[PDB]
Structures are given as C-alpha cells and as structure tokens.
Amino acid sequence: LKAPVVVLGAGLASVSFVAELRQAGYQGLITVVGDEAERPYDRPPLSKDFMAHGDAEKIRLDCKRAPEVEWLLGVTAQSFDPQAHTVALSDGRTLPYGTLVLATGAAPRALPTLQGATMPVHTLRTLEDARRIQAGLRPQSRLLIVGGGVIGLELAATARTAGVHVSLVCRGPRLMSRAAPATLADFVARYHAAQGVDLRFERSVTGSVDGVVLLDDGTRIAADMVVVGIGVLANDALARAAGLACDDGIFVDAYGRTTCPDVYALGDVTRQRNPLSGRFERIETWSNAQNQGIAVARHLVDPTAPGYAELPWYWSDQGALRIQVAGLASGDEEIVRGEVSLDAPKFTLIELQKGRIVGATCVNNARDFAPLRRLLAVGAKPDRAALADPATDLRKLAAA
Amino acid sequence: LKAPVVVLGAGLASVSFVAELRQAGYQGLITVVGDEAERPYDRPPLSKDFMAHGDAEKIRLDCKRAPEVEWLLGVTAQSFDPQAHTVALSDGRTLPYGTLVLATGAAPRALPTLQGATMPVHTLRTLEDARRIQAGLRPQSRLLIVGGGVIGLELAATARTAGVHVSLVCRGPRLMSRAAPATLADFVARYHAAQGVDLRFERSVTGSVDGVVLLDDGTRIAADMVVVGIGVLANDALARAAGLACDDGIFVDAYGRTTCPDVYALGDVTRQRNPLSGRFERIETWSNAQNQGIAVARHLVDPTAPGYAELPWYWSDQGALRIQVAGLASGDEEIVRGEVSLDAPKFTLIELQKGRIVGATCVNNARDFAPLRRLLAVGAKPDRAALADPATDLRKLAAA
Ligand SMILES: Cc1cc2nc3c(=O)[nH]c(=O)nc-3n(C[C@H](O)[C@H](O)[C@H](O)COP(=O)(O)OP(=O)(O)OC[C@H]3O[C@@H](n4cnc5c(N)ncnc54)[C@H](O)[C@@H]3O)c2cc1C
Ligand SMILES: Cc1cc2nc3c(=O)[nH]c(=O)nc-3n(C[C@H](O)[C@H](O)[C@H](O)COP(=O)(O)OP(=O)(O)OC[C@H]3O[C@@H](n4cnc5c(N)ncnc54)[C@H](O)[C@@H]3O)c2cc1C
C-alpha cells in the first residue's frame, strides 16, 4: 500500500473499498474518479422499489465511513500509465498514484440484431437508464424483455404491477440459466406466467421492423419498448490498453492484484476464483462488490490479513418472490425443504456434493438463509433426512 | 529484471528463456531447477523418431546459447515465498531470487475410470514415459489409445509401423477436437483407419477387468497396454499455494507477469491471451514454449521491447502425414487448395473470417506453410479464387 491511492469507478465496490481503507487506518490521500455525475448510488433498487417509486435519495451509498476522500464525479479516466504511475482524466487533469484500483464495473451487452432499430430499445444498468425506462412504463403499454436473467425478471414484475403488458424472449429453455438451480428457475417461470408474463423460451431475436420485433421461429412480437438484458461485459478497456491480463474481466488473485504491479481491481470488472468451483469466473453480485472491496482494502492496510475468501450469494426481488441463492446451482443432490407451490410460496433448496453442502436457495424464507450460508461456509455434511425434515432447526445446526 | 534470476522447470520454455536472457545481455546469476534428472531435452521426438529409434542423445536441447547457468537437475522446487523472495528445494537448500520464473509445464491427465487398473496403463510426457512405453511395443501386441489428440495419434502411427495392433477410443465424434479444422480431422481418421487403426468414436472408458478395458456402450477391448492421452493439466501447484491467480494454468499478460510482483511464468504452465480469438487459453505447443520464453526474456532485459505477440501454430508427424496447423481451426469460410486424398496426400486449408485469413493447414506441403503464416500474421484479405487457384504463388503474395 503506497500512497496516494486512486480508484477508478465510484460504484459499490469502490465505496466499500475506500471506506475500509479508512476504517483500517490508512490516512493517506484517496481520490476516486467516477464517470457518472451522480452521488454514488446502489444499483439493486433500480429494478425494484426505485423503478416503482422514483426517489433517488433513497438509493445513495453511505460515504461517511469514507472521510477525506475526493470524489471526482462526472469525470472519465481515459488511460493510465503504469510506469509513470499516472492516470489521464477526461477533464484534462492527471492524477499521480502509488496504488491504483480499477473498480469500473460492467456494462450491459448490446443485442447485435437490434442495432439500427427504429423503436425504443434500452438496457438497465444506471440511474439514467432506470429513469428512461420508467418514463416509458405507461399503463397498458407493451414491454418486451430480451433475456432470462434476474434483472429483466425484476423489471417484468415491476412492470406488471404498474399495469404494463410484458412479453419475454429467452434463448435458453429456462430462466436464470446463470447460477440458479433448475428447480428454482422452473418455479420462477410458473410464477411469472401466472402473473401474466408472456414467456417465450428457446427463441432469439433476429431483428425488428416498424415497432415490431422478429424472432428466429419466423414470428413477431409488437412492443412499445424493448429492454435488453442478456448479460454484461466487464469495463476492462483501460486495463487492456495498459497491458494487464484480461478476458472480459481483469484477472485478479485473492489480494485483488492484477498482473501489473501496484494495480488492483475489484467488483464486477474482475475475473476471479470461485472457491466452491475452484474455477475463475466473473462474479456479478452486490455481495461480491462489497465483500471483495473490503477484503482487498483490509489486506492492503494489513498484509497479515487473509485474502478475499467469501463464498458467492445473491438475492432477487420478483413481485411476491423474495429469492436468495448461495453457492453453486447444483451438485449431485438437491434436498427440497418444504413444498414448491404458487399458493403462498415458501421453500428452501439445498445442493450437496457427496454429502457436503455446496449451495442453497430460499424463497420467502430469509430466516433459513443465514444458517445455510454458514453451513455452506464450512462445507458441512449434515444428516440429509434432517435437512429435508421440516422439524429441523437450521440455526441450531449452524451454531453446533 | 532484478538479479538473481531463478527458473523453475528445465524444459524448452526455460531453456529458451535463459538463452535469450544471455543473448540479450543479462550477465547476472541464473539458476534453473529441474525435477527430471535428465540433460534438458525436447519432447516432440518422444512420440516420433525417439519412440522408433531410442537414442536420447539426438533429442537434447542446446544449452550453449545459455552460458553461465547452473542447472539443478533432479531437484524439485517445493514452494516459494514471494515476500522473502526465496524458493525451497527438495534437497534441503534454499535459493534467493530477484526475479522468479515459473516454467513448470503440464502433466498428463489421469483417467479416473482406470485408477486401480491391474494392466499396464501409461501416459506419454517424459523420456522415462517414452522408454517405458517403447519397452512394451512388442510386435503383434495390442495397444489401446485413449483420447483423440495428436500425441496419441503419433504413437498410433509409430506403433503400427512397429507391427503393433492399435485400437483407439475417442469420446468425441472426431479426432483432434482441439485446434484442428474438421476437414483435417476427418481426413486424419481416414488415414489411420487405412493403416489398420481400429477407431472407436463417441465412446468413453468405464473401467477395466483382468486385462480388458470396458466402454460406455457396454462393450470390451482387450489390450496388452493402454496409453492414456486425454490432455494435460498445468503444473501450477506452487503458484496456487503462493497466492497467484491460476485456473488450470497461471494467468499471465504479454510480458509474462503473474499477479505476484517479481514472478513470471512461461510455456505450457500459462493461461494467456490468444491474439486471434482475443480469449485466454492454455497453449500447449512447442512454438509457444520457445517463443513466449524468448519474448518474456527479451522484454525483461529491454523493457522497450514489445510483449509476446506471436500467433499460435503447431505440427504433428503421423506416419505418412506431415501436418502443420496455424491459427484458428475455423472461421466463416474454408478454402481447400488441392485435393484431399489418401493417394499421395498433399493439401492446404485456409480459414477465413470476413475475408481475413485466421488459420491455415498444410499436409505434406511445408513450402506453403511459411507464407501462409505471414499472411495470417498481418490478417491478410487476399483474393479467394486465387487462394483456391492452384496457379497461385503464395510466397509471392506474402512478399507483396
Ligand atoms: C438494475 C440492477 C439490479 C441489480 N440487483 C442486484 C441484486 O438484487 N442483488 C445482487 O446481488 N446484485 C444486484 N445487482 C448487481 C450489482 O449491483 C453489481 O454487482 C454492482 O453494481 C457491482 O459494483 P461495482 O462497483 O463493481 O461496479 P459498478 O456498480 O458498475 O460501478 C462502476 C462504476 O465505474 C464507472 N466507470 C467505468 N469506467 C470508468 C472510467 N474509465 N472512468 C470513471 N468511471 C468509470 C461506471 O460507469 C460505474 O459508475 C444489480 C445490478 C443492476 C444494474
Ligand atoms: C510426446 C510429446 C510430443 C509433442 N509433440 C509436439 C509437436 O510435434 N509439436 C508441438 O507444437 N508440440 C509438441 N509437444 C508439446 C511440447 O513439447 C510442449 O508444448 C513443451 O514441452 C512445453 O514446454 P515447457 O517448457 O513449457 O514445459 P515442459 O516441457 O513440461 O517442462 C517443464 C519441466 O518442469 C518440470 N517441473 C514441474 N514442476 C517442477 C518443480 N516443482 N520443480 C522442478 N521442476 C518442475 C517438469 O517436470 C518438466 O521437466 C509435444 C509434447 C509431448 C509430451
């Protein structure tokens, strides 16, 4: 940890990182460069309560645990020179650094077949994106979602609640193909279908003409707005140009180190080891952004601290479904705890591999999720009849 | 480049690297740690002329362009401490380093279903492996090859020439699924079948009993020896233990830098950018080991030198087939230059992507291969009728 510290990006990973630097006792300069001209804010509300209620002053991040930080908002870092240890800014200034931290996140993938569309086509990543989409969620209008991911499904639920007709086109046979158990994905489709979403599986968009989207089965879907949500691409251009190892994401180890000395990376922009799979992956979650930011900062201030070691998890709020998913989507066994039903949905899934818990899901059961995450953390091998047995107190198991 | 230099591994990548350090003018200490108690040697002969003729003094690497190097042969590096800048050796000694270079290669994957086999089961990586296999290539004996890769096919050809019966089990529908055009793979199967190889596609080994191998179609293949060749796994254990970013291979950038300052990696052990695909891959070729070693050394001595930038290629010698393959196996177009025939085989394939050459293959035509590699290097977009037209002088095109 060499002063001064410069962080590129002012999202959750950056804020979490700089707050932890201060909390851990680093007192040198910290400067954060953020391209959005917005008080730093959290993204999960954008497809949830913000999309529904519109108050950005409810979604700001707390920068108070990060005192003495200069935030350069509305400024783009255009390049860095890792030999000279400088960053070039879009406003004409240059920042020196002792330690540079790349926390530039990821951007929605564009859909090539809708390039040159002459109807509204949006993606949902930023506060600006959310305001734009919300401005078009007119009651009785028609929205088409492209993609099977959670964000689009959250938007679908929000739109249905607002009286918007919703169709959805998914290239795969199931929703939430990324990091979600099939049992959950199947149930989620049943839920959305019951709420009036017109779901089209194993279909791809081939183009659009005069307000109508074309599909690869030779059919058409008319819509007033398309929201594309087919995933994101790491914002790793500065790293690539500067000679760091990257491949849709900046490769980092558990200390957040890139292949360039004195340059670290955090959050959505990184490709990193998933300890459960033992494979490198680009993790796309709120918990990773916060936890990785904190762990990297902690180890920078105190090199005796362990590297980042938290296991993955996320949540999604889709209408009546409060979904929580931890670890791996599958193993060699799933245990279903409770009944899977559209009538007052409430259930828990546990994924095991040779008796060891490797993942869990809770739908409308936050109380189960925390002890399951602890059991997951230590690779617990509990009695499987009991795991299924409704009589079982999971918090007790975790404590033991 | 901080002295002293320590290199772990004494294969081609290591030898190429240390020779280039010396040629570029570095005069500080160089120590190489090699676990094999063998004068450094090249691997391609092991499934080719060595397997056929057995003289190891024809396969040694030239270490003369690497003067003043201490080679610690028959010694295993057990760990390194990147803070203390030391390496712990199996003989009880410790080496200090200013710059550490990991060139530890890769080892054959074991076949889980043949663990506990009570018949000879070998892999083919080392001089020791080759001598062991050769000692069992008795005329009229039966050899089973598991895997569709080039090394097993080279062994198959060598064995057939020696009068050994050969069967081969391939899990995929084609041979050489890795980095070989389908047109080449199909022809190669026809060639081996014509030479008496018993080829079994889309079959996997499920086990073995009393000298007989079991397949997933419920059938059996008796053999006197099994040689498993289903690929290799990077020898990245020291890197993993020391906290470097790895995933079946040590991630490096074009300068050979790992995520740990002062630690570099080269050769088969690395996962690195393929410039043609723009994706990270573990390259498994002789040309990469030599070229990457040279480029990394050059840039260490002269930081103004470019990073590693060579495009991939390899060759394979399979009986009457002298195969050369460069670049990508496929694009959006293949041009076939010549006829594809078992009667005096000689042809060239060119792979294009939107008119740009992205790969090439020559079978028994070394003269075509060099100019094609040059056209590939600059992403040439030549006239495609001419590329197909037999009248065409490719060397002239390259020069122009
Ligand atoms: C709509 C939506 C809903 C979500 N819901 C959930 C959820 O319920 N649960 C969950 O687990 N996760 C959710 N996520 C995911 C989560 O929010 C992300 O994982 C998180 O935002 C990643 O934080 P980050 O700081 O790494 O990246 P970002 O939030 O993308 O922040 C990076 C910032 O850096 C900026 N930047 C990029 N390049 C430059 C540059 N050259 N110069 C200056 N600035 C630059 C970016 O524009 C951006 O402002 C959601 C995301 C979205 C978009
Ligand atoms: C049979 C065979 C045929 C081949 N034919 C061809 C061909 O025709 N064309 C082609 O393009 N490529 C071919 N190859 C591939 C090629 O030879 C490899 O790409 C090349 O050997 C890689 O070189 P390397 O130095 O990175 O690794 P290696 O050659 O594997 O050298 C690494 C060395 O480091 C040692 N080591 C590992 N760990 C330690 C440790 N902890 N301490 C000390 N030493 C350690 C290893 O045991 C090994 O001796 C062939 C390979 C084989 C095995």
XYZ file of N, CA and C and ligand atoms in Angstrom, chain B residues 7-16 32-38 41-48 51 61 72 74-79 87-90 102-108 124-127 129-130 150-152 154 232 235-238 266-270 283-290 292 313-317 323 325, ligand 2:
296
model
N 14.707 -19.907 -12.309
C 13.685 -20.502 -13.156
C 13.344 -21.887 -12.627
N 12.052 -22.155 -12.468
C 11.573 -23.456 -12.020
C 11.064 -24.230 -13.222
N 11.705 -25.366 -13.493
C 11.472 -26.151 -14.687
C 12.644 -25.980 -15.634
N 13.048 -27.075 -16.274
C 14.162 -27.091 -17.228
C 13.764 -27.713 -18.568
N 12.546 -27.426 -19.010
C 12.105 -27.792 -20.340
C 12.399 -26.708 -21.357
N 11.792 -26.850 -22.529
C 12.029 -25.936 -23.638
C 11.772 -24.468 -23.293
N 10.707 -24.184 -22.550
C 10.403 -22.789 -22.241
C 11.519 -22.173 -21.400
N 11.938 -22.901 -20.373
C 13.045 -22.485 -19.527
C 14.345 -22.290 -20.303
N 14.732 -23.294 -21.083
C 15.975 -23.196 -21.845
C 15.934 -22.009 -22.813
N 14.801 -21.835 -23.482
C 14.661 -20.744 -24.442
C 14.762 -19.401 -23.742
N 18.602 -22.627 -12.658
C 17.420 -23.340 -13.141
C 17.238 -24.598 -12.310
N 16.020 -24.831 -11.833
C 15.698 -26.005 -11.029
C 14.860 -26.952 -11.866
N 15.346 -28.164 -12.133
C 14.607 -29.107 -12.961
C 14.394 -30.434 -12.264
N 13.142 -30.863 -12.122
C 12.887 -32.066 -11.335
C 13.352 -33.363 -11.993
N 13.411 -33.385 -13.315
C 13.881 -34.576 -14.015
C 15.395 -34.619 -13.967
N 15.947 -35.786 -13.637
C 17.392 -35.965 -13.667
C 17.802 -36.326 -15.095
N 17.651 -35.362 -16.001
C 17.963 -35.558 -17.412
C 18.545 -34.287 -17.980
N 15.897 -31.767 -22.579
C 15.561 -32.449 -23.816
C 14.241 -31.947 -24.387
N 14.058 -32.183 -25.676
C 12.835 -31.786 -26.363
C 11.843 -32.946 -26.355
N 10.565 -32.619 -26.217
C 9.510 -33.633 -26.153
C 8.949 -34.136 -27.495
N 8.862 -33.282 -28.548
C 8.262 -33.815 -29.787
C 8.843 -35.139 -30.326
N 10.165 -35.375 -30.205
C 10.673 -36.664 -30.683
C 10.109 -37.879 -29.947
N 9.584 -37.711 -28.734
C 9.193 -38.848 -27.897
C 8.088 -39.721 -28.482
N 7.226 -39.143 -29.312
C 6.166 -39.909 -29.954
C 6.460 -40.058 -31.437
N 7.688 -39.735 -31.820
C 8.110 -39.740 -33.211
C 9.381 -40.589 -33.327
N 10.662 -42.712 -30.238
C 9.829 -43.873 -29.968
C 10.209 -44.986 -30.938
N 18.313 -30.559 -25.819
C 18.251 -29.134 -26.140
C 19.637 -28.529 -26.081
N 20.170 -27.187 -11.766
C 19.980 -28.121 -10.663
C 19.020 -29.204 -11.109
N 17.297 -32.993 -11.316
C 16.885 -33.989 -10.352
C 16.452 -33.388 -9.025
N 16.086 -32.101 -9.051
C 15.712 -31.333 -7.857
C 14.309 -30.750 -8.042
N 13.454 -30.889 -7.024
C 12.104 -30.347 -7.095
C 11.988 -29.086 -6.261
N 11.452 -28.026 -6.858
C 11.073 -26.859 -6.071
C 9.775 -27.186 -5.344
N 9.781 -27.064 -4.022
C 8.630 -27.476 -3.221
C 7.700 -26.329 -2.879
N 8.243 -25.118 -2.814
C 7.448 -23.925 -2.538
C 8.290 -22.698 -2.822
N 13.051 -19.688 -2.715
C 12.494 -20.940 -3.189
C 13.056 -22.072 -2.329
N 12.184 -22.957 -1.862
C 12.604 -24.105 -1.064
C 12.747 -25.327 -1.961
N 13.911 -25.979 -1.913
C 14.202 -27.138 -2.761
C 14.113 -28.458 -2.008
N 13.830 -29.524 -2.746
C 13.664 -30.852 -2.170
C 14.959 -31.396 -1.577
N 8.333 -19.159 -13.448
C 7.691 -20.454 -13.336
C 7.501 -21.045 -14.725
N 8.238 -22.114 -15.027
C 8.208 -22.749 -16.346
C 8.082 -24.255 -16.170
N 7.075 -24.639 -15.400
C 6.933 -25.992 -14.882
C 6.058 -26.896 -15.753
N 5.577 -26.371 -16.879
C 4.875 -27.184 -17.859
C 3.548 -27.746 -17.391
N 3.215 -28.929 -17.890
C 1.926 -29.556 -17.631
C 2.147 -31.059 -17.589
N 1.234 -31.782 -16.951
C 1.332 -33.233 -16.809
C 0.089 -33.866 -17.402
N 0.213 -35.081 -17.952
C -0.972 -35.761 -18.486
C -2.076 -35.948 -17.452
N 2.148 -40.457 -21.822
C 3.338 -40.155 -22.616
C 3.699 -38.671 -22.549
N 4.580 -38.332 -21.612
C 5.045 -36.956 -21.433
C 6.572 -36.879 -21.380
N 7.194 -37.798 -20.646
C 8.623 -37.693 -20.350
C 9.462 -38.727 -21.099
N 10.779 -38.550 -21.063
C 11.704 -39.541 -21.597
C 11.500 -40.879 -20.877
N 8.689 -41.929 -19.538
C 7.435 -42.482 -20.044
C 7.657 -43.163 -21.385
N 8.422 -42.509 -22.258
C 8.644 -42.995 -23.608
C 9.400 -44.312 -23.574
N -3.278 -35.362 -30.877
C -2.162 -35.641 -31.781
C -1.103 -36.592 -31.221
N -0.779 -36.479 -29.932
C 0.292 -37.311 -29.383
C -0.073 -38.796 -29.474
N -1.299 -39.129 -29.077
C -1.772 -40.498 -29.192
C -1.786 -40.993 -30.630
N 0.224 -39.876 -33.029
C 1.625 -40.061 -33.384
C 2.135 -41.398 -32.856
N -3.643 -32.565 -20.902
C -2.722 -32.275 -19.815
C -3.319 -31.234 -18.875
N 1.030 -27.614 -14.420
C 1.729 -27.814 -13.164
C 1.847 -26.498 -12.404
N 0.718 -26.029 -11.880
C 0.676 -24.706 -11.261
C 0.537 -24.750 -9.735
N 0.879 -25.877 -9.115
C 0.679 -26.026 -7.676
C 1.467 -25.016 -6.849
N 2.712 -24.730 -7.223
C 3.497 -23.777 -6.434
C 2.902 -22.373 -6.510
N 5.893 -18.985 -17.929
C 6.093 -19.247 -19.357
C 5.705 -20.632 -19.731
N 5.304 -20.802 -20.987
C 5.169 -22.130 -21.561
C 3.850 -22.803 -21.259
N 3.869 -24.127 -21.226
C 2.676 -24.943 -21.028
C 1.943 -24.622 -19.721
N 2.643 -24.075 -18.734
C 2.017 -23.811 -17.446
C 1.113 -22.577 -17.484
N 1.200 -21.761 -18.535
C 0.473 -20.479 -18.541
C -0.894 -20.520 -19.224
N -2.090 -22.601 -24.038
C -1.499 -23.049 -25.281
C -0.545 -24.206 -24.936
N -0.541 -25.224 -25.782
C 0.167 -26.456 -25.455
C 1.172 -26.826 -26.524
N 1.870 -25.836 -27.066
C 2.714 -26.081 -28.234
C 4.179 -25.762 -28.003
N 5.013 -26.457 -28.772
C 6.451 -26.236 -28.804
C 6.757 -24.781 -29.173
N 6.091 -24.269 -30.207
C 6.377 -22.902 -30.642
C 6.026 -21.881 -29.558
N 4.949 -22.116 -28.821
C 4.670 -21.209 -27.721
C 5.740 -21.252 -26.632
N 6.166 -22.453 -26.256
C 7.179 -22.590 -25.215
C 8.440 -21.819 -25.595
N 8.908 -22.016 -26.827
C 10.098 -21.299 -27.268
C 9.851 -19.799 -27.431
N 7.346 -17.727 -26.425
C 6.955 -16.988 -25.234
C 8.146 -16.828 -24.306
N 0.786 -21.859 -33.597
C 0.866 -22.884 -34.624
C 1.531 -24.108 -34.028
N 1.301 -25.244 -34.658
C 1.980 -26.475 -34.278
C 2.114 -27.382 -35.498
N 2.786 -28.511 -35.302
C 2.890 -29.527 -36.331
C 2.700 -30.869 -35.664
N 2.438 -31.883 -36.479
C 2.337 -33.250 -35.998
C 2.807 -34.181 -37.103
N 3.593 -35.187 -36.734
C 4.088 -36.183 -37.680
C 3.394 -37.500 -37.406
N 1.825 -32.904 -40.839
C 0.725 -31.975 -40.613
C 1.249 -30.694 -39.979
N -0.409 -26.846 -38.641
C -1.642 -26.085 -38.408
C -1.316 -24.771 -37.740
C 5.195 -36.632 -26.521
C 5.035 -35.214 -26.876
C 5.051 -34.817 -28.210
C 4.886 -33.461 -28.545
N 4.917 -33.116 -29.863
C 4.796 -31.827 -30.209
C 4.875 -31.389 -31.535
O 5.207 -32.269 -32.546
N 4.608 -30.125 -31.862
C 4.314 -29.256 -30.892
O 3.977 -27.995 -31.290
N 4.334 -29.558 -29.592
C 4.563 -30.843 -29.237
N 4.575 -31.181 -27.926
C 4.314 -30.145 -26.958
C 5.590 -29.520 -26.370
O 6.572 -30.351 -26.299
C 5.268 -28.660 -25.162
O 4.479 -27.593 -25.553
C 6.521 -28.210 -24.436
O 7.184 -29.333 -23.886
C 6.230 -27.222 -23.302
O 7.466 -26.807 -22.717
P 7.553 -26.263 -21.256
O 8.985 -25.910 -21.012
O 6.515 -25.149 -21.039
O 7.095 -27.426 -20.328
P 7.770 -28.853 -20.000
O 8.398 -29.395 -21.226
O 6.698 -29.724 -19.385
O 8.914 -28.587 -18.958
C 8.629 -28.333 -17.599
C 9.556 -29.034 -16.700
O 9.429 -28.525 -15.401
C 9.398 -29.634 -14.563
N 8.789 -29.275 -13.261
C 7.473 -29.216 -12.976
N 7.344 -28.851 -11.689
C 8.570 -28.686 -11.140
C 9.051 -28.339 -9.889
N 8.150 -28.040 -8.776
N 10.355 -28.262 -9.687
C 11.197 -28.528 -10.696
N 10.796 -28.865 -11.916
C 9.481 -28.951 -12.158
C 8.679 -30.643 -15.364
O 8.734 -31.964 -14.795
C 9.295 -30.507 -16.637
O 10.550 -31.196 -16.719
C 4.735 -32.488 -27.556
C 4.739 -32.906 -26.218
C 4.890 -34.247 -25.882
C 4.876 -34.645 -24.443
